Amino acid sequence: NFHATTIFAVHHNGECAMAGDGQVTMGNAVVMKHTARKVRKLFQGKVLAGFAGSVADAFTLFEMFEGKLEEYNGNLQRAAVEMAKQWRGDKMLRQLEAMLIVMDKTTMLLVSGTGEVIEPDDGILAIGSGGNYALSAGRALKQYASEHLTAKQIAKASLEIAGDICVYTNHNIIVEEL
Amino acid sequence: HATTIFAVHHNGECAMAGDGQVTMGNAVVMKHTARKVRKLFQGKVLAGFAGSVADAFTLFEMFEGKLEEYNGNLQRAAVEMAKQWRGDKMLRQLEAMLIVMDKTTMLLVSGTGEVIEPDDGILAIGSGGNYALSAGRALKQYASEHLTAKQIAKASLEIAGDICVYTNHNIIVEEL
Amino acid sequence: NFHATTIFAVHHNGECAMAGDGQVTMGNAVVMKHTARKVRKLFQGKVLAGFAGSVADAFTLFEMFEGKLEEYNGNLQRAAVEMAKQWRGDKMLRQLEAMLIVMDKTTMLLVSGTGEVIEPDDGILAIGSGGNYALSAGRALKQYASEHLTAKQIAKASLEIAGDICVYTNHNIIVEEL
Amino acid sequence: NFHATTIFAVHHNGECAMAGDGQVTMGNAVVMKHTARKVRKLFQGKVLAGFAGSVADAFTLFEMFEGKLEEYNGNLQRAAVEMAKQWRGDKMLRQLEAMLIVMDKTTMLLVSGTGEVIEPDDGILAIGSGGNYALSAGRALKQYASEHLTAKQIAKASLEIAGDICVYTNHNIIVEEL
Amino acid sequence: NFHATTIFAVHHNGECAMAGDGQVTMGNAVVMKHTARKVRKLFQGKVLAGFAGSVADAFTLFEMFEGKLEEYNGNLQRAAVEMAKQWRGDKMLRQLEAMLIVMDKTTMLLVSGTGEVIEPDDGILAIGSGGNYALSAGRALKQYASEHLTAKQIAKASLEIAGDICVYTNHNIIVEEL
Amino acid sequence: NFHATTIFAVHHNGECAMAGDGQVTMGNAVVMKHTARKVRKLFQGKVLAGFAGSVADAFTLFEMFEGKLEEYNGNLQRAAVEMAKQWRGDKMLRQLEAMLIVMDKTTMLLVSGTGEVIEPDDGILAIGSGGNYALSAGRALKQYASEHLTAKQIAKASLEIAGDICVYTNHNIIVEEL
Amino acid sequence: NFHATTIFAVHHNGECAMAGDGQVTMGNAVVMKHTARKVRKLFQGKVLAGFAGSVADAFTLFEMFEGKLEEYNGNLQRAAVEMAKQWRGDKMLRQLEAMLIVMDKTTMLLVSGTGEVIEPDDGILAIGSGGNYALSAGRALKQYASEHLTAKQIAKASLEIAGDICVYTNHNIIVEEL
Amino acid sequence: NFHATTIFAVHHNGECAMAGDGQVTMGNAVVMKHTARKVRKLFQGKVLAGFAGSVADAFTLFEMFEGKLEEYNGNLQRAAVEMAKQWRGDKMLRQLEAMLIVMDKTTMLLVSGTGEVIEPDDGILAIGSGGNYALSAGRALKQYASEHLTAKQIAKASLEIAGDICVYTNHNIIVEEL
Amino acid sequence: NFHATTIFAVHHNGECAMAGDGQVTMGNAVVMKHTARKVRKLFQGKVLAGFAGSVADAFTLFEMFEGKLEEYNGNLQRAAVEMAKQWRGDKMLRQLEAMLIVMDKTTMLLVSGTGEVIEPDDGILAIGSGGNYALSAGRALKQYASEHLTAKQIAKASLEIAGDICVYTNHNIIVEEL
Amino acid sequence: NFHATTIFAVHHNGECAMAGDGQVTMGNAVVMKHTARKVRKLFQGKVLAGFAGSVADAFTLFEMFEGKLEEYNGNLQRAAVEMAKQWRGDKMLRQLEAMLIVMDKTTMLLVSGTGEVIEPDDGILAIGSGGNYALSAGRALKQYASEHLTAKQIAKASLEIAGDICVYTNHNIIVEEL
Amino acid sequence: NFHATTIFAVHHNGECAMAGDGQVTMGNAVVMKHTARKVRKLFQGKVLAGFAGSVADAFTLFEMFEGKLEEYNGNLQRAAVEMAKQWRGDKMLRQLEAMLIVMDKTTMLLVSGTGEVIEPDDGILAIGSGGNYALSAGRALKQYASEHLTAKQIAKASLEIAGDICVYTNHNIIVEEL
Fold this sequence. Notes:
Chain B: It is found in: Cytoplasm. This is part of a larger assembly, with eleven copies of chain A. Chain A is an alpha+beta fold. The first copy, chain A, has one domain (1-178): 4-Layer Sandwich (Glutamine Phosphoribosylpyrophosphate, subunit 1, domain 1), CATH 3.60.20.10. The first copy, chain A, contains four helices and eleven strands. The interface between B and H is medium-sized, with 23 and 24 residues.
């Protein structure tokens, strides 16, 4: 019943940033902890990935995906595919409605338990309870504000706005960059 | 969604406070600053109401009306308020609840014609209602001497703010 | 089975603007008209109002409020709530899910049939199918891009952004100012 | 949470075409992606196949079906049946709502997880979100506009039409000919 | 328990047409009638109107709308609005799911009980069961087949197509021209 | 969302016939193929079987029964129930809503996944979307028109009648006899 | 909760017959009386009408309709219209899901509380719990058996077959003729 | 229809306490037990654990996690995760809504069948029926009473407040320490 | 959550009886009353009536119908209809599911809020909780015990069997005669 | 939202006692008030009454009934019948699920908004949240403990037991006599 | 479909009694069996047990538990815990909503398929259809009537009361002792 934390990833001005909040919501109305860290670097810091869902789910995926990386030599395109395939295979895992973002220097993708793999056109991806508000914020900035802001600043911001619009997203915001 | 309001009778002090969060539909907050608590009866009383602003002022007026008729007897005037609320067709459909308090006593009135007086002198309504209440009664009971009414009222809502998603941290507090 | 247009209203840098797209969606699938006009100036051009729903209701609520306006010395605040008390009263109109935005040079208000009247904190109001998206976009620009964008520009952007993402908002956008 | 892209296929004047749009809508409200490749040729370019659903799924079925195509020596009909049987069988795949269109020069078929195999009488097939709209469009053209268009031209126009009407279908369109 | 017949309307090359099928399906399974007249001209033959729903209803609205047409001196737009208002108002009529298409030489509109008034950009309107199919067909033709057909020809073909696809639409078809 | 074809089976005046229409309906609205073949002779042409549902399941159940047939000295009765005990057994197949008709020169049986095996009293069995209509038509003819119609004629009529009324049955009807 | 008795009307070989059964079903499973008479002559035996629903509903309609007759001079066409209109008007009456058949020497119609009026092409109408089976039976006979049966015999029969197929229709069958 | 007892844990000023009530409610309305043992010292008294649900589930879990600890050499954090991964692994237990608090002298963790592992930001966890009320009281006393209360006192007090408020919590309270 | 007492009426061998039990069940589980007066002689003892529902409803109805009788000069049949028409007229009572039996020395009638008036074919009516069980027993004794039992005996016996079987019927039974 | 208070009444050995608990529980788990007084003496202290529902309603009802008592000259029975007519009549009040107990020296009665009026044969009544549990105990005690106990005694005891079991009944209990 | 029998257990003044009624009510209203024996002595007549559920299940359970008793050397507590693990473990049995009471001279316990094990502090237990009503009465009597009553006496009495109120509990009652 836990509600998905909000994660955002951006490629801007030759920079890659990914942020997420710390809010943990049990049931409809209740917040257990505000400090959750949902974003991490993999492949020896070559890739930034994040997952909205459970902690033990977070790592099992992270595990088997970095597997796809090592197999596929850090090709995000083929690894995520082979990842989504293997996700779609697992009886207990297909179930997860939460999704996964991955990105490296080159690109970013979105992987789901339904076997979906999505690459954005605008180099912006957002998931989680508040992803949509975050996505609205970032695009607005990146397209319109393009030369007045960094990725770290676009990403950080995008999680603030959603933090204001959304009940399931808080203001403790962890930011990583490649 | 209904904002969270807390009322406490403590150490001779009367405080009521509420958050400012206005939640549209499911996940969306329209406004963080709404003031749900106001003085009435030339400042003799505090009232608070969870729901709509429009329905706030009708009931407030409605109640303050009772107070004038009933010579500022909160006990009597709150009862007559509940009867009347229950009589009006569209208003008796209101989910949101109403806390009134004076220096002497506090009351909770609903559109179901319910009238509640807390035995511990703490009343809290709204989304984070349960959370503020527990927080408040805990302080009152255990932390008694080390805290004031205004402080307990502030704290309870600070706590309500953190556990409850529909209670934010923008908080106004009133005192008699 | 109709899908409301998307209206956006902003007070920025001492300027005011209200804008909207024209897309109307019947069924969950179908789009008929690309351009629709629901945003109307009232009170001899001193007030911008907008409503995302049916044209019939639109005119009804508008005229109602310009009525509420006339009575009150054009006190935007009192008139809103007078309409709000009124709107709740009507058994037919009370039941509308859609909302009304009314603003002037000074401030803007969000009025609902529930009786709710809401003044925004940041000087931005959004309603309709794409409301939240534009709302997020606009807040982002306003707070972050504040120096570089006008009220006019922020509105158009928000809806345009809304149009880019939400399937129910398109890019045909009219902008009115005070 | 994803909305299917739209696929169309037509036999005309001895020409074959299959076509699909790029729009990917996640959430009932929101567009993730404007492109993808869900129509891929098979069987040494002799067969076109398309599948509206997820990437890991399309790959699985295409692979599944192509393996069938070989066992039976290029019989689209026998293949699709054994395809439909195995698909019906697989507990994880049995549940899939999206459908598969396969096509060769002589014939075209539609397969489902329910173990259905459908052969259109008029040689026009459409699946996914805007199937209804793209089906109606292409037939309308094929019958009435027959003299003035090719299969390529018909398929491009059908999706152009669904993309014009259906909120979940857009104009980024790939057309494949056999 | 009745399924609506299908109505279509198109402005083309300075020609107007409205058309409808005869099929009446009562029970989700069964056809009662192959004919009816639900498209009737109005306003001295200047206006065509059509309504997919029941006989007592069509007669009421047509009458309702025509009375509007007169008060306002042949203004289709003002009329349809006052039509949409009154319809929205009537407690018994407010509830009606079926929609009304009215049309004149210069313009065409669509009205609903919700008080909606819709003006297509491309001058093609369809309602009832096979609206989706007849809409897609006619637009497909109007855009692509433009040179080779008339408005009459388009409307006859659109319904011929919906009647070919939709199980609730048949081939007994009346076409009215202004 | 598929709609079963309509099969009709009759024993009359010392003759036997099984017939069916070809119409297949996807969605509640759409019709793709007008002509479908689900009625198959088995046991070296000594038995007519028919099944209204998916071709995959069709072949599966058919082959199953012709299996049950082979074991039993072609005792139609025992074989039915052996299949019926079997059909219930399979967890995947048990759940089918559709039914199977099996007959020979002597008699006909109605077999379901529930385990039910039914021999008709009047020598008529009907299944599929139009089953009840044809069933009613056929019984009418058989009982009343008994002198003037053959088994062959009664079947064709029933389905034709079924086709006339039920939106899901069409008039393309193949007739097989023993 | 009572279940609608079954009524059938036929124009055949220059004869008009209308039959209905006597079964009265309370709740889902329960039968209170088997003898109900739902068919009667009106207009001094000039017209045969029947109603599936309640007894007090039966007569209020019968009353106000014969009203339409006398007003309209026994024109079944205009009276039924004016009837359906007046039915559609009544707050308590629109509610009735049961319907009304009327016929005279010339023709037959079906009137509903939704303001529907339907005239069959084949001169056969059937309503009530078992109308569909009855309709299937009669058409079969009238079209195929045309010269071997009277209306009284077609009508009577049609209620027998349905009487066999349907749980809510019994074998006490009243027959009237014009 | 069973209601969990209430369990509360706190790390305060260098000490730790875990406490629980005794009330077990059957149906929504009824109490049988006034007391129990639901908070059990594990790992030779080095860790505290409690679980709100059934005794049998608990003793499965407790022993299971007690297993993990041994395996992982007392690492609370790494043990929790392998438990959760295992908990969510088993398809019988994964269904458990109730959650587990584990505690040592350093940190505390909250574990759910979902695979979630949570470390409170405040060093406070509560589970079961009065769970919300406990958490509110405790956090209230930890932050504003901080000087005047100890861990055990707060555990005692928090469960004391819930029992006053929550209808499913009583005043029989046992506190465990490390 | 209230359960009607049980009432049974019979016309047998020139005599009549109406009887009822005393059990009133509150909730699905609970009995308070063992007895009542629910079957009341009307029209100066000339007719018998009973109603299964609330006392207040009854006394409304009884007096209401007692009104009709006077109006119509004791005609049971014509009175019943105007009652029913009136009963169904009132929008507060029309909602009553419970039904009324009225009886004189000649015939008996069953009246519902729906507007239904029913004359049993067998001269037997039952209403209320054990209603089905009573009717079964009574009809059983009337047809196969006919020589050996009287009206009062059967009333007594029928309600005696229901009380044995129906959980909502007891053995306190009062019989009224005309 | 709130849970009804629990009231118990008893006639024992010539003495009357009506008692109630104080607990008012709002929302699923939450107790707002420890002490409530909803049991009133009426009619010169000759009548006891209680209502488990809201305080306002208690007034209106007690008010309403005392008028019936006086109009009917202290006749508890006709005053109860008339009130139940008025109550059932009121559009607002009829909706109340909570019930009323009234009692004098001779008898005790229960009344509802459905118009029911109940007299227990054993002279014990109970309503509200522990209504079931209080009745049993009281009836248990009255019957078996008859010699050793009084009315007040049994009354006090019954709620004491109810309050001991029922989660929603406390121990703050007021008893009254006559 | 069936309703559970009602069993009551009591520890009073040093003596143990477990009693049950016979009534078996199938379907909503219908009583199939007046006398049932589901309470068994186990472990050399040292243990009383009862199960309100089906006879077969009673066997399997009683069987299962007596094994636990012996494995655990008559330890009612660990035998109860282990059984509840086995019970909760069984895929078939876990689903049982009916519960088990077991008792010896020292204590009494209640067990469920969810793995719960319950010890009442007042040494009274009740299960099945009147479970609530029997407990209250027993706890009522034990507490207040303690001097005048025995275990058998209170046991017999409790079910007697339950059977007097609960519609689903009869008076055919078997009591057992230790």
